[PDB]
Amino acid sequence: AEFKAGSAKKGATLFKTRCLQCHTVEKGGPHKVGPNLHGIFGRHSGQAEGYSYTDANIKKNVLWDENNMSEYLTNPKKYIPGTKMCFGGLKKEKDRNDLITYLKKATE
Amino acid sequence: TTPLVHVASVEKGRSYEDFQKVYNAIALKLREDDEYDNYIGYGPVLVRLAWHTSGTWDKHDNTGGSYGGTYRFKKEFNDPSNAGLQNGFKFLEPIHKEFPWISSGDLFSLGGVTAVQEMQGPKIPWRAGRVDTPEDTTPDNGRLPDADKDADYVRTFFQRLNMNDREVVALMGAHALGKTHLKNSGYEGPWGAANNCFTNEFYLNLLNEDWKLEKNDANNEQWDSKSGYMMLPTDYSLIQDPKYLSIVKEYANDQDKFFKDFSKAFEKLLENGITFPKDAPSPFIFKTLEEQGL
Ligand code: HEC
Numbered sequence: 439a440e441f442k443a444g445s446a447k448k449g450a451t452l453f454k455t456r457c458l459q460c461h462t463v464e465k466g467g468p469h470k471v472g473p474n475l476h477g478i479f480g481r482h483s484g485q486a487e488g489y490s491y492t493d494a495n496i497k498k499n500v501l502w503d504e505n506n507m508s509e510y511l512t513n514p515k516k517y518i519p520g521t522k523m524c525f526g527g528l529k530k531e532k533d534r535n536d537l538i539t540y541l542k543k544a545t546e
Numbered sequence: 547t548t549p550l551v552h553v554a555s556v557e558k559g560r561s562y563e564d565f566q567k568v569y570n571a572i573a574l575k576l577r578e579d580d581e582y583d584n585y586i587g588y589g590p591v592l593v594r595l596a597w598h599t600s601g602t603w604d605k606h607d608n609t610g611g612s613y614g615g616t617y618r619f620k621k622e623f624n625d626p627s628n629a630g631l632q633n634g635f636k637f638l639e640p641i642h643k644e645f646p647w648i649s650s651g652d653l654f655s656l657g658g659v660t661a662v663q664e665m666q667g668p669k670i671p672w673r674a675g676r677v678d679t680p681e682d683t684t685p686d687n688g689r690l691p692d693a694d695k696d697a698d699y700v701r702t703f704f705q706r707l708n709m710n711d712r713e714v715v716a717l718m719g720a721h722a723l724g725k726t727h728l729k730n731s732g733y734e735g736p737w738g739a740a741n742n743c744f745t746n747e748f749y750l751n752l753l754n755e756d757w758k759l760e761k762n763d764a765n766n767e768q769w770d771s772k773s774g775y776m777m778l779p780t781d782y783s784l785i786q787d788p789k790y791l792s793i794v795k796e797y798a799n800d801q802d803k804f805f806k807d808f809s810k811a812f813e814k815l816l817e818n819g820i821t822f823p824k825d826a827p828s829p830f831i832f833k834t835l836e837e838q839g840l
């Protein structure tokens with residue numbers, strides 16, 4: 439997948455409706471069902487201090503960037519077989535681009 | 547002369563490829579109309595629909611059950627125990643219109659099978675052949691279980707569906723799916739966080755969360771945890787009863803085991819009351835969309 443800048447506002451709505459259930463994005467924000475995502479880009483998978491990751495997530499050892507994040511969100515279980523994140527994926531490129539444009543900003 | 551028998555009769559020329567086409571239609575719509583219930587999607591309500599339409603069965607006189615597809619009639623449609631199921635019914639309407647030849651009971655049950663499989667649950671062998679019966683065959687309300695009860699109530703209730711301890715505990719694991727809605731049942735909240743993925747989370751949460759019995763906004767009591775999950779009084783009775791607890795524990799520690807038992811119990815549930823000719827086809831095991839490179 440190759441990221442292309444989109445709409446942060448629409449991404450914020452996608453996050454609220456599809457992600458907030460399990461993740462927070464603010465710096466120092468709390469872990470919930472899923473790991474807090476602040477600082478996610480530029481960090482390796484399964485490294486959020488204080489969160490109990492699945493064995494599969496940590497072993498993926500992916501250094502998250504806008505592109506592999508797009509690949510991941512297209513089909514999570516496919517990219518990280520065995521992850522415990524329950525989410526079928528955002529199948530539309532436009533959707534993934536708006537979301538990551540927002541995530542890049544909200545986490546930053 | 548004497549008691550009701552319901553013989554499985556699959557429409558002429560209709561075979562496995564036909565039913566797989568219906569399965570695909572449901573699975574596709576499940577993906578397309580994904581906003582429902584804050585994006586949980588229609589999978590859980592479809593599973594609850596298959597269960598409520600089959601759960602009216604009384605093994606003592608063979609009334610109710612999935613055979614006749616009577617939920618389409620007023621009386622059952624408006625059973626308060628079915629509040630919210632109208633959503634699953636509406637979801638399936640267009641599907642039935644595209645495939646007019648499928649029976650109502652066959653469609654309601656296939657809907658539950660498809661939803662379980664598409665939510666990554668176990669494969670549920672399924673058999674076609676349910677036949678629509680007249681309005682007069684619609685059971686009265688009152689046959690579905692009350693959630694504010696205890697283990698003894700759960701055990702004796704399920705005896706009417708010919709279900710044993712193992713089958714009861716396994717079937718209850720479907721509560722991993724969806725959530726309770728205060729406007730529908732007087733209870734509010736999800737049993738877990740993976741609302742639209744079929745796992746053994748129900749048993750894990752039952753055993754690992756710290757539960758506190760509390761009143762909700764409808765004045766009913768439910769067991770709530772700090773994580774924001776809930777358990778109905780009947781769900782929690784599974785760890786109050788010793789026999790049930792041992793089975794809860796084994797599913798909590800072995801999902802493959804839960805999957806296999808749930809598969810057997812759910813098909814049995816779906817086929818209760820049905821007499822299948824001995825020359826009838828082997829149950830069908832539909833391929834998921836993923837399994838079709840789709
Ligand atoms: C639960 C129902 C969740 C929803 C909805 C989403 N996520 Fe998730 N996410 C969740 C869990 C429990 C986990 C852990 C996975 C594991 O196997 O341990 C995650 C993980 C991620 C990750 C990786 C984080 C890291 O490696 O540090 C990302 C980047 C992530 N989730 C993103 C994310 C987004 C953008 C979501 C919606 C579109 C989303 N998650 C939904 C649980 C849940």
Ligand code: HEC
Pocket residue numbers: 590591593594597629630691692693694700717718720721723724725726727728729730731732733778780812
């Ligand atoms: C194999 C299926 C299955 C069994 C058996 C089952 N349920 Fe559930 N039940 C569901 C599903 C799935 C939902 C979630 C529905 C949704 O999210 O719309 C549900 C939802 C409910 C709800 C909430 C409905 C609402 O929308 O408010 C109640 C209350 C309930 N079940 C009670 C029971 C009781 C009592 C028993 C038996 C002791 C039982 N269930 C057995 C599948 C089942």
